[PDB]
mmCIF file of C-alpha atoms and ligand atoms in Angstrom:
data_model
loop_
_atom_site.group_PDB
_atom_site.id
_atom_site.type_symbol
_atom_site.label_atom_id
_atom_site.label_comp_id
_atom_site.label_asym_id
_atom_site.label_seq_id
_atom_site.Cartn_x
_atom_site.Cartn_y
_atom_site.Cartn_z
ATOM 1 C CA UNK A 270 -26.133 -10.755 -7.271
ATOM 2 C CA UNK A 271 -24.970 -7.755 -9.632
ATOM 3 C CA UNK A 272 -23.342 -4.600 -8.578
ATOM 4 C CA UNK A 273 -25.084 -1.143 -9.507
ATOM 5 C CA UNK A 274 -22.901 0.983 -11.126
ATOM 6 C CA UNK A 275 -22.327 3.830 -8.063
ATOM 7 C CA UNK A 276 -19.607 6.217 -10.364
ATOM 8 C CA UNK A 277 -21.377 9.328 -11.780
ATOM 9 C CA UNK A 278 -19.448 11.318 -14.411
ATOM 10 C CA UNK A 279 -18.755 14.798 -12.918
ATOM 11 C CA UNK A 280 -15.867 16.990 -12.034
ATOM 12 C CA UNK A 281 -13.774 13.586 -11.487
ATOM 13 C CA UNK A 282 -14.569 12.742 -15.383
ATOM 14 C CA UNK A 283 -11.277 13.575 -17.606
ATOM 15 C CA UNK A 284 -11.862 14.203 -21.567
ATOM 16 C CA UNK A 285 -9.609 11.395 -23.035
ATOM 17 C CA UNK A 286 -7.564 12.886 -25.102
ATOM 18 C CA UNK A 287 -6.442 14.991 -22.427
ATOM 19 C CA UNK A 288 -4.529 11.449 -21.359
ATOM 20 C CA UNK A 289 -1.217 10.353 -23.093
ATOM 21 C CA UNK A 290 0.154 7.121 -22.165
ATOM 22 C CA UNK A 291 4.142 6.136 -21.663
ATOM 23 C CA UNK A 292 5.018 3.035 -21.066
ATOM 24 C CA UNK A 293 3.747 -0.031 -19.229
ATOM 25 C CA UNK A 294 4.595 0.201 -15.299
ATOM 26 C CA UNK A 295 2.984 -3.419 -14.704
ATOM 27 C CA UNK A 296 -0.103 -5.794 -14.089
ATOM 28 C CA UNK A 297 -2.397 -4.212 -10.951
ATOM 29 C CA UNK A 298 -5.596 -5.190 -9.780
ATOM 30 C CA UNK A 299 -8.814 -5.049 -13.618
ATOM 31 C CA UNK A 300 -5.853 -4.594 -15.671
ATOM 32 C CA UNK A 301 -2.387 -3.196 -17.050
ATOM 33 C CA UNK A 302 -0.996 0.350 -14.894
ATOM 34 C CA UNK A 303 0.718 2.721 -17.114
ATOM 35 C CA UNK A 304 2.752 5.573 -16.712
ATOM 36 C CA UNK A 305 1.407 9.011 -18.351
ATOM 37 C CA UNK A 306 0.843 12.629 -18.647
ATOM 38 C CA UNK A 307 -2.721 14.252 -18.414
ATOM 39 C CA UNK A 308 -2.640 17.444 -19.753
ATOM 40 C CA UNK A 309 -4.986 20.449 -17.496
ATOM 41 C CA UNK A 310 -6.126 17.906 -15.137
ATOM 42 C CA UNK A 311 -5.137 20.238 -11.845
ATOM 43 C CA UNK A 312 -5.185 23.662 -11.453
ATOM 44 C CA UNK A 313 -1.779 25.818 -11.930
ATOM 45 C CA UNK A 314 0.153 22.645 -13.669
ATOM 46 C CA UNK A 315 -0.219 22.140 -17.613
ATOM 47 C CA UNK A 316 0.873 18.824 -17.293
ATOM 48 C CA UNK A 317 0.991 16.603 -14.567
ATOM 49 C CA UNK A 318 2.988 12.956 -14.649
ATOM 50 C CA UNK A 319 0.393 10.360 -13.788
ATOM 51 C CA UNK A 320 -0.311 6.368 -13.432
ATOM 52 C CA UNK A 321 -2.800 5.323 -15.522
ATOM 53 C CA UNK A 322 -4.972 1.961 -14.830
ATOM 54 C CA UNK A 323 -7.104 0.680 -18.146
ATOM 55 C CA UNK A 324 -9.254 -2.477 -17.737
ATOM 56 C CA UNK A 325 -8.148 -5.903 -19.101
ATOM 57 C CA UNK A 326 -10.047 -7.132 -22.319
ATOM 58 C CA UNK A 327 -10.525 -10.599 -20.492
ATOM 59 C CA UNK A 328 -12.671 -8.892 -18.243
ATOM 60 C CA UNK A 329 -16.400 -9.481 -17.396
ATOM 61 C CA UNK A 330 -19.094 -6.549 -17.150
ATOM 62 C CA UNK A 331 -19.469 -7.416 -13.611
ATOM 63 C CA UNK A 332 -15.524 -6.614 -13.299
ATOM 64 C CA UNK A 333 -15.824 -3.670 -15.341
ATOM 65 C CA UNK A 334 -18.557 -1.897 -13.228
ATOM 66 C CA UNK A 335 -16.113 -2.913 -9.865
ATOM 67 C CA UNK A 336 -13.340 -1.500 -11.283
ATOM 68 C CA UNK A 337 -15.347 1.933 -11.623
ATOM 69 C CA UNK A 338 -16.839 1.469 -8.141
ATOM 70 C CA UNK A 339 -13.545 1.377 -6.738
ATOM 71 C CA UNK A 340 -12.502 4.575 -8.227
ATOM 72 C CA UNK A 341 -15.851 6.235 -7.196
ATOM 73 C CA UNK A 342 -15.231 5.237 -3.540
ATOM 74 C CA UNK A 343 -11.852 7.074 -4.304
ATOM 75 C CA UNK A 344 -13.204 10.375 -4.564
ATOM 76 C CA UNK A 345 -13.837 10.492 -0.936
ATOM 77 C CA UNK A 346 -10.146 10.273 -0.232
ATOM 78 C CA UNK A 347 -7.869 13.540 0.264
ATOM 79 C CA UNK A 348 -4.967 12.169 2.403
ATOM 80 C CA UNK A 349 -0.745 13.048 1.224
ATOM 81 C CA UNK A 350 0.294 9.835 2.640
ATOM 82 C CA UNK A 351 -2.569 7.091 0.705
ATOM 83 C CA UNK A 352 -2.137 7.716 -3.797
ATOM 84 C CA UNK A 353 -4.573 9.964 -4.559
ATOM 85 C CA UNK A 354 -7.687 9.504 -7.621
ATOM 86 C CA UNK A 355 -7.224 12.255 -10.095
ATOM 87 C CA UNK A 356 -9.829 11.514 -12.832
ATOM 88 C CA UNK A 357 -11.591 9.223 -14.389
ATOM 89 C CA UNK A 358 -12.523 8.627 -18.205
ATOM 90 C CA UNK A 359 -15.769 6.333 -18.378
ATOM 91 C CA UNK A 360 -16.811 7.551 -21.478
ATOM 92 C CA UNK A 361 -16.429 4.635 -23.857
ATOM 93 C CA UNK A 362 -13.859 1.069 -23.565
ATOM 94 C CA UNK A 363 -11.082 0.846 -22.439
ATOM 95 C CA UNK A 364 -12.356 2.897 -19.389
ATOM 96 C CA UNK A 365 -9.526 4.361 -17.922
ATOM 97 C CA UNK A 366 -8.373 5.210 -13.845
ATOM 98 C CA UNK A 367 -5.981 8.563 -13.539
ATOM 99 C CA UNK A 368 -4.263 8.132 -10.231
ATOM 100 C CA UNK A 369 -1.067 10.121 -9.137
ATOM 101 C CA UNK A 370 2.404 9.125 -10.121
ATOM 102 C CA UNK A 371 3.973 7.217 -7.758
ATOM 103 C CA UNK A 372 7.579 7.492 -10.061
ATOM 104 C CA UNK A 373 9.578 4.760 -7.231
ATOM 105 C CA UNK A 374 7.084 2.340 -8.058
ATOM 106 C CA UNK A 375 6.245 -0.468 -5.023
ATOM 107 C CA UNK A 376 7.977 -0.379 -1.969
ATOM 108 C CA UNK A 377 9.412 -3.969 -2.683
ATOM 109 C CA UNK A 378 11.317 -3.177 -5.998
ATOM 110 C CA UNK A 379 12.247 -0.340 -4.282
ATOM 111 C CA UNK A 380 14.036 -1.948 -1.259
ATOM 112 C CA UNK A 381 15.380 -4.559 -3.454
ATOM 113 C CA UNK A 382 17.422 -1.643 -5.787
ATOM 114 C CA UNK A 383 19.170 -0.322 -2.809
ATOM 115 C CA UNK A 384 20.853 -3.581 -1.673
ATOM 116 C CA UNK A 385 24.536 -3.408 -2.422
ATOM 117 C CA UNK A 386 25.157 -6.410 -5.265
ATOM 118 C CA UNK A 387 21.391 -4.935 -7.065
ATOM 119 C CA UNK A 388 22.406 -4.487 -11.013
ATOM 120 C CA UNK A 389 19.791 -1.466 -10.518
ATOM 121 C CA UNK A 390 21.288 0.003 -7.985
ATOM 122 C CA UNK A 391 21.176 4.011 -8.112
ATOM 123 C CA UNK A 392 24.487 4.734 -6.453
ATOM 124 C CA UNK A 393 22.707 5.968 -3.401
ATOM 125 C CA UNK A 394 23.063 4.136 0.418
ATOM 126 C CA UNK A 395 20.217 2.262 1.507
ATOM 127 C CA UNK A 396 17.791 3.780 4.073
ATOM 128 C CA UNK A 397 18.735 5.274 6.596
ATOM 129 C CA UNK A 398 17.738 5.281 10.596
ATOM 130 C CA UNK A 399 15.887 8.688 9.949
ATOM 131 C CA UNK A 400 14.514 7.789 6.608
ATOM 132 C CA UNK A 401 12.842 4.517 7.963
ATOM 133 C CA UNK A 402 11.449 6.434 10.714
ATOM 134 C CA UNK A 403 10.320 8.644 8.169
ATOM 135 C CA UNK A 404 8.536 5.693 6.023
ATOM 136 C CA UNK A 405 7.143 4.612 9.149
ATOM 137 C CA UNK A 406 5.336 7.319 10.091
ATOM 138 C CA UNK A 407 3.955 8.071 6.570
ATOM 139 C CA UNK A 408 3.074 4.662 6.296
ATOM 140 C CA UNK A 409 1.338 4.735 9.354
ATOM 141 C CA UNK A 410 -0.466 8.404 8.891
ATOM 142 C CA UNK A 411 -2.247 7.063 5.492
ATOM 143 C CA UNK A 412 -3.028 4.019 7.345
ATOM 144 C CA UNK A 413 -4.603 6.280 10.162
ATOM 145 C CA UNK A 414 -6.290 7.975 7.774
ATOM 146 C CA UNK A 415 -8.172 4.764 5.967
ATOM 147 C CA UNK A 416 -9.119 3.389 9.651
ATOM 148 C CA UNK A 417 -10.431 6.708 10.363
ATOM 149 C CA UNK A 418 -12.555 6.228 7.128
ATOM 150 C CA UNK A 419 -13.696 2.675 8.366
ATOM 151 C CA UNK A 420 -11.421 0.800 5.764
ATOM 152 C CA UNK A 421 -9.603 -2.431 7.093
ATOM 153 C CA UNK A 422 -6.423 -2.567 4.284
ATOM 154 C CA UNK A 423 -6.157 -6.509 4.822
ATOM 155 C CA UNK A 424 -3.269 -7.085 2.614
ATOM 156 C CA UNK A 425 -0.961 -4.340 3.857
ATOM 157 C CA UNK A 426 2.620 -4.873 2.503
ATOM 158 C CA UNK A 427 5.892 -3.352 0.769
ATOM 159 C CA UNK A 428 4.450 -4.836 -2.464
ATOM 160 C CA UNK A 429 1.586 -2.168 -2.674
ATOM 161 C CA UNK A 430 3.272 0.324 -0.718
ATOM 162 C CA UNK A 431 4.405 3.118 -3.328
ATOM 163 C CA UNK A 432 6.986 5.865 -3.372
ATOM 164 C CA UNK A 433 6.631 8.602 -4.625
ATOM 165 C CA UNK A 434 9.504 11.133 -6.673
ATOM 166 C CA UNK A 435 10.676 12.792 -3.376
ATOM 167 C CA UNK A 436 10.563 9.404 -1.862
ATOM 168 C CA UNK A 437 7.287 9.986 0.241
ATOM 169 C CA UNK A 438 5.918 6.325 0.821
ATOM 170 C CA UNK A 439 1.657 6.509 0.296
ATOM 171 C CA UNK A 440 -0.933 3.605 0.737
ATOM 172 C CA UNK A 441 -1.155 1.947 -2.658
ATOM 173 C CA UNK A 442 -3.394 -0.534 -3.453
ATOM 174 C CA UNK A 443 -5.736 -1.613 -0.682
ATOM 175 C CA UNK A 444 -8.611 -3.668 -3.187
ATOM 176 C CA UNK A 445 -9.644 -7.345 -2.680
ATOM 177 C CA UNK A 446 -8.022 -8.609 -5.712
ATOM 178 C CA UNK A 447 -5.385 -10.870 -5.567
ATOM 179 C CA UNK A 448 -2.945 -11.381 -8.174
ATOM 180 C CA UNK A 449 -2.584 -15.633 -9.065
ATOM 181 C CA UNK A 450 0.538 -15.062 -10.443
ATOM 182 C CA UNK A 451 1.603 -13.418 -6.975
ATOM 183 C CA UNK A 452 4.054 -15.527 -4.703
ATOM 184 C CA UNK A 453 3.453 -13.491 -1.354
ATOM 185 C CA UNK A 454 0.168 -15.255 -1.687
ATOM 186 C CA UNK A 455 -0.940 -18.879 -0.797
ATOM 187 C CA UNK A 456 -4.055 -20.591 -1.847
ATOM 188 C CA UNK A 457 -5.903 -21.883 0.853
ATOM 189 C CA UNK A 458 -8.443 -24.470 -0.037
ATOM 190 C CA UNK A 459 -11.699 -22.932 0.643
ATOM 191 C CA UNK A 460 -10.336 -19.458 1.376
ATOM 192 C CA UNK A 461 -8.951 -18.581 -1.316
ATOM 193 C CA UNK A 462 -5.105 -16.316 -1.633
ATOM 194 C CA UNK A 463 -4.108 -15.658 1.538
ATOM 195 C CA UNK A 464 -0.762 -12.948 2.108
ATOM 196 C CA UNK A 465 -0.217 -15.913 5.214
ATOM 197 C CA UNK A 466 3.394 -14.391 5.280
ATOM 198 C CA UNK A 467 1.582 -10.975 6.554
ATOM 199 C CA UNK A 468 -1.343 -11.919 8.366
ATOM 200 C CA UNK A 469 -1.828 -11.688 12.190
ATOM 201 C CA UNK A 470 -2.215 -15.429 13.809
ATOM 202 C CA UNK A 471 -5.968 -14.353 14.812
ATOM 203 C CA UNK A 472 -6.634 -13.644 11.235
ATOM 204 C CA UNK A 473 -5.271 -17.325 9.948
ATOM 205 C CA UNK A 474 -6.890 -18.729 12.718
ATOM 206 C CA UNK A 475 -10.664 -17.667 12.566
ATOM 207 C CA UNK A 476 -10.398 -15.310 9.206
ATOM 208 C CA UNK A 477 -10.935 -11.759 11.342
ATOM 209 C CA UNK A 478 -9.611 -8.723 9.652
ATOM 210 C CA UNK A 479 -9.073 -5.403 11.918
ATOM 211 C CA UNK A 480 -7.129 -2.591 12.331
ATOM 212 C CA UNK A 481 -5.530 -4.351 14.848
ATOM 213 C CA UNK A 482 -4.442 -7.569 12.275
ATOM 214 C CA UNK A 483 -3.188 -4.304 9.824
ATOM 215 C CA UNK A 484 -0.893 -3.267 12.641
ATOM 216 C CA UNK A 485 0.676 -6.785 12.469
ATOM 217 C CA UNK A 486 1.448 -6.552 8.794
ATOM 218 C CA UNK A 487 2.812 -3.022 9.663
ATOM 219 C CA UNK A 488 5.561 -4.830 11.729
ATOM 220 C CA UNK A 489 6.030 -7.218 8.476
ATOM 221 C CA UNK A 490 6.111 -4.160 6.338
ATOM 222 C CA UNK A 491 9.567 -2.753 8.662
ATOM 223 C CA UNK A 492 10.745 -6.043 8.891
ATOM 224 C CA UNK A 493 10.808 -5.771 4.830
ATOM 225 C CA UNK A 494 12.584 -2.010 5.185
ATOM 226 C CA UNK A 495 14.711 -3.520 7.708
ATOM 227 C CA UNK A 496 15.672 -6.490 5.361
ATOM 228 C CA UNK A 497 15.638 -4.467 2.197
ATOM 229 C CA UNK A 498 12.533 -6.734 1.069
ATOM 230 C CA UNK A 499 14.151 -10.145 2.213
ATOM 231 C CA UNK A 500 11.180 -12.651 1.574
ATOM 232 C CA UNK A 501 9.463 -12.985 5.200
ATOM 233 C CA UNK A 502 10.031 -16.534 6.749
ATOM 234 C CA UNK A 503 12.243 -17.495 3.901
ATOM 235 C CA UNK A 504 13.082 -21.510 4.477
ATOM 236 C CA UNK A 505 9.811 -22.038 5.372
ATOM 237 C CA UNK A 506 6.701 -23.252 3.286
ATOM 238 C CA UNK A 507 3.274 -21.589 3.619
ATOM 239 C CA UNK A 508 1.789 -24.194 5.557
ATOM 240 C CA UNK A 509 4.920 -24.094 8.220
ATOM 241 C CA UNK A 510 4.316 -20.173 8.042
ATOM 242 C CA UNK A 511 0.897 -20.692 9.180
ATOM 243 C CA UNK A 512 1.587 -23.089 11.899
ATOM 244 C CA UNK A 513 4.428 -20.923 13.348
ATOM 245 C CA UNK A 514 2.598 -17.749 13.820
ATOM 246 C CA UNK A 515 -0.264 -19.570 15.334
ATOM 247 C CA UNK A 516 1.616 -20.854 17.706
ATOM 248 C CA UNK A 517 2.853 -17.441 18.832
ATOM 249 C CA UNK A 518 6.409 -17.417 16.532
ATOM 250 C CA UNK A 519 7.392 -14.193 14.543
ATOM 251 C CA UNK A 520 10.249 -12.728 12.481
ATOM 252 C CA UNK A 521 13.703 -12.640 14.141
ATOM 253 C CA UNK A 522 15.401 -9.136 13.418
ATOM 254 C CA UNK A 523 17.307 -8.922 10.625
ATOM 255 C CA UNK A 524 21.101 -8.723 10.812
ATOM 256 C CA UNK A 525 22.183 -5.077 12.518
ATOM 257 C CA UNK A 526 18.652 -3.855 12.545
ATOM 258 C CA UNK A 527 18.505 -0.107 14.398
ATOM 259 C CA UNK A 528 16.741 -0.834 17.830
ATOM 260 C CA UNK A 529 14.083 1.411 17.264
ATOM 261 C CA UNK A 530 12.312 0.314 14.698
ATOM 262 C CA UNK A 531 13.186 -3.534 16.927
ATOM 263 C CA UNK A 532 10.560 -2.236 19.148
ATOM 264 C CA UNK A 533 8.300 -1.033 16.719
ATOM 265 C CA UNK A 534 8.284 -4.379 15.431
ATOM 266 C CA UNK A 535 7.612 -6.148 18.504
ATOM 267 C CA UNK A 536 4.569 -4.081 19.751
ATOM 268 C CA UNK A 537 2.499 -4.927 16.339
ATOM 269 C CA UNK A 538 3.767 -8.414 16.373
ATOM 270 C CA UNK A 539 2.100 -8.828 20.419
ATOM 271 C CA UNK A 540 -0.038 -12.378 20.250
ATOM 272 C CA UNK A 541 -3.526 -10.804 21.688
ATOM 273 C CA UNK A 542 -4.516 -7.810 19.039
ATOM 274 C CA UNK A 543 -5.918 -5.606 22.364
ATOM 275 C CA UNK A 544 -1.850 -5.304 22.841
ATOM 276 C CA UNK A 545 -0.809 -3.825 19.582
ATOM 277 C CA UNK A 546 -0.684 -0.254 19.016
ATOM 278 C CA UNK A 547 -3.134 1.917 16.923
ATOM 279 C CA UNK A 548 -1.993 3.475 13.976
ATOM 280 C CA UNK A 549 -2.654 7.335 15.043
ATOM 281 C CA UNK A 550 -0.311 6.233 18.083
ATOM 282 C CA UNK A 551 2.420 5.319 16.122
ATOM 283 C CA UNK A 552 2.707 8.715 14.320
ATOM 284 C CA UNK A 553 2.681 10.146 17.610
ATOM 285 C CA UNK A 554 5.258 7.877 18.979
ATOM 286 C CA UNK A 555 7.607 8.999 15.869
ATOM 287 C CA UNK A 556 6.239 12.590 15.439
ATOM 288 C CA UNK A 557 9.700 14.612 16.770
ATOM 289 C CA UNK A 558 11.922 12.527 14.555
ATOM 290 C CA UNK A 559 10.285 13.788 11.237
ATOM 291 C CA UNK A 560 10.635 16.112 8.266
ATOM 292 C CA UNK A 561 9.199 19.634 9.135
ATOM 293 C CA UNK A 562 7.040 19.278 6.277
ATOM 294 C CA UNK A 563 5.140 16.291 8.206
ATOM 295 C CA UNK A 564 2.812 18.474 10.294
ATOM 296 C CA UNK A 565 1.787 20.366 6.946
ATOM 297 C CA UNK A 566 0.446 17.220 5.284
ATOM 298 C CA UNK A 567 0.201 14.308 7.436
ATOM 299 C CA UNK A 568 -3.760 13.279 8.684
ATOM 300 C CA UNK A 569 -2.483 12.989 11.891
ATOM 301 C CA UNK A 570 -1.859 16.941 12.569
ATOM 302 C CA UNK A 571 -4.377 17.534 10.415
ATOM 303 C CA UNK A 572 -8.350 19.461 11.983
ATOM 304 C CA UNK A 573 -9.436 15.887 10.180
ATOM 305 C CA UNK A 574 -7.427 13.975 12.976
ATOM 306 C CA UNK A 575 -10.471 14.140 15.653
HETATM 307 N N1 LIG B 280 -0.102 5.206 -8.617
HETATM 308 C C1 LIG B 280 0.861 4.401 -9.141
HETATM 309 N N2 LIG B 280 2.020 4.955 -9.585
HETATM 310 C C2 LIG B 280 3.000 4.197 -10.173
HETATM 311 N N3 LIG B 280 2.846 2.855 -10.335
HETATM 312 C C3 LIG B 280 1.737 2.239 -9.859
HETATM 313 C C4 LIG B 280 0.739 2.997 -9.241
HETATM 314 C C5 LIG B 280 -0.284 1.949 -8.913
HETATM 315 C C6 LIG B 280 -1.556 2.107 -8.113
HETATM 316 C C7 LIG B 280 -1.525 2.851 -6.923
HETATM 317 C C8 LIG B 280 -2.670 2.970 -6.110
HETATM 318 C C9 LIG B 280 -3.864 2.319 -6.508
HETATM 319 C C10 LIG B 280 -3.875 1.542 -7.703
HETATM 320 O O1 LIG B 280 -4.981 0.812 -8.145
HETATM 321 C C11 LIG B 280 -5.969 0.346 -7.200
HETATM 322 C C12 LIG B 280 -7.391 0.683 -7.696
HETATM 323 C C13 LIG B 280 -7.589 2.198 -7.986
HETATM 324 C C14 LIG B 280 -9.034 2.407 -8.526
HETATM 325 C C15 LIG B 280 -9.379 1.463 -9.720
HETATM 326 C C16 LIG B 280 -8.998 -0.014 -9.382
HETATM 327 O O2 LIG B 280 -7.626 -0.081 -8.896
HETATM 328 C C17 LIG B 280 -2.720 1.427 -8.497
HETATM 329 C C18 LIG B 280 0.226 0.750 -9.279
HETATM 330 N N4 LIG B 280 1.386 0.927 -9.862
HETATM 331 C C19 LIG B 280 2.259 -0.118 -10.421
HETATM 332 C C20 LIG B 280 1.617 -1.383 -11.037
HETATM 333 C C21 LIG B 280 2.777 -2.195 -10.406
HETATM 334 C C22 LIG B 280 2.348 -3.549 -9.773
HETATM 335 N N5 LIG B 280 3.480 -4.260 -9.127
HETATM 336 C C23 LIG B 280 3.158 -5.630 -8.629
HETATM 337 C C24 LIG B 280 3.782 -5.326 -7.246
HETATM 338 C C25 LIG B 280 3.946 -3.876 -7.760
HETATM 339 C C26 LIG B 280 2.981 -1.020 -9.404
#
């Protein structure tokens, strides 16, 4: 077993030195994520602000060739609401991955610099009933969108959730590499890290991975707006985790959550996955609570949607 490399320089294939890079934005999956600028890279912008993933040293040629793959696969997506591939240089080492800017960062750090005692708080309130709705909904739409394109996210949290400069939340990273250094995970002997704070019980019980065990970490992911990215089942060990939401247990609502986003919760967190919701149904649950621009750029109104 070796993988074929499946990326093919064309249009997607950025000169270089048309990439200048910032400052360090931290460790992702193949290697460090930077923030840049890439000078002509889309049409009527000189310069356009951009996150820019290079591949570790410490990295194998298998890993190297995977980390390409995953950008080729990439070029196939075209949705507002999941962070977009905007060019690739594979022409020599370090190769390098141009994605959009997501200048928030992860929905986690995010949360956690609008709670009120936060030494990085930015003197704005935290989220508000409309604005979680709004989250929600985008959340869900770019989720919509990557079950509509046969992906199952499988590790679908506030941690690779990213927000964008106007605040638009997008599907970050959805890959199969987990970070060792990562707490939201737990090793599991024989199965490897496991986000067993986010996974639906089917999933820790038999290892299944659906759209339907995404919607349950959907739930997780409000529960995390709703707590302002309060650690999920904090007092309880991994193993005690696992053994509660087998048994059918789940997150009590956080202190003076709004009611409906309560319900939201509930529905994805129902034991047998034929219960939950579907993504494209939760956009249209939400869809007459949202900012006018939604129906301009969301998969869900888009001719796509079918
Ligand atoms: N766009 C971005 N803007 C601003 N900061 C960004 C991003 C990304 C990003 C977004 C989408 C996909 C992606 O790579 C997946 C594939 C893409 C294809 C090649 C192989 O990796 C990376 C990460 N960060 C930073 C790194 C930091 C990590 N901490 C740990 C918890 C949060 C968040």
């Amino acid at each position: 077993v070796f993988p074929s490399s499946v990326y093919v320089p064309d249009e997607w294939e950025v000169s270089r030195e048309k990439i200048t890079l910032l400052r360090e934005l931290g460790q992702g999956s193949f290697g460090m994520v930077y923030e840049g600028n890439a000078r002509d890279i889309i049409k009527g912008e000189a310069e356009t602000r951009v996150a820019v993933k290079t591949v570790n040293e410490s990295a194998s040629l298998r890993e190297r060739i995977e980390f390409l793959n995953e950008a080729s696969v990439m070029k196939g997506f075209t949705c507002h609401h999941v962070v977009r591939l905007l060019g690739v240089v594979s022409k020599g080492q370090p190769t390098l991955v141009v994605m959009e800017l997501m200048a928030h960062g992860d929905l986690k750090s995010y949360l956690r610099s609008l709670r009120p005692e936060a030494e990085n708080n930015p003197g704005r309130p935290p989220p508000t009933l409309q604005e979680m709705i709004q989250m929600a909904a985008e959340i869900a739409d770019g989720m919509a969108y990557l079950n509509a394109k046969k992906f199952v996210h499988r590790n679908l949290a506030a941690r690779n959730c990213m927000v964008a400069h106007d605040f638009t939340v997008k599907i970050g990273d959805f890959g199969m590499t987990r970070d060792i250094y990562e707490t939201d995970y737990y090793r599991k002997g024989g199965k490897g890290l496991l986000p067993v704070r986010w996974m639906a019980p089917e999933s820790l019980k038999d290892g299944v991975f659906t759209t339907s065990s995404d919607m349950w970490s959907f739930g997780v992911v409000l529960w995390e707006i709703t707590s302002l990215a309060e650690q999920p089942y904090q007092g309880l060990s991994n193993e005690q985790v696992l053994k509660f939401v087998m048994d059918g247990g789940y997150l009590d609502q956080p202190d003076n959550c709004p009611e409906r986003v309560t319900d939201l919760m509930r529905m994805c967190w129902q034991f047998n996955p034929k219960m939950r919701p579907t993504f494209l149904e939760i956009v249209n649950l939400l869809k007459d609570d949202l900012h006018p621009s939604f129906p301009e750029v969301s998969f869900f109104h888009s001719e796509e949607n079918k």
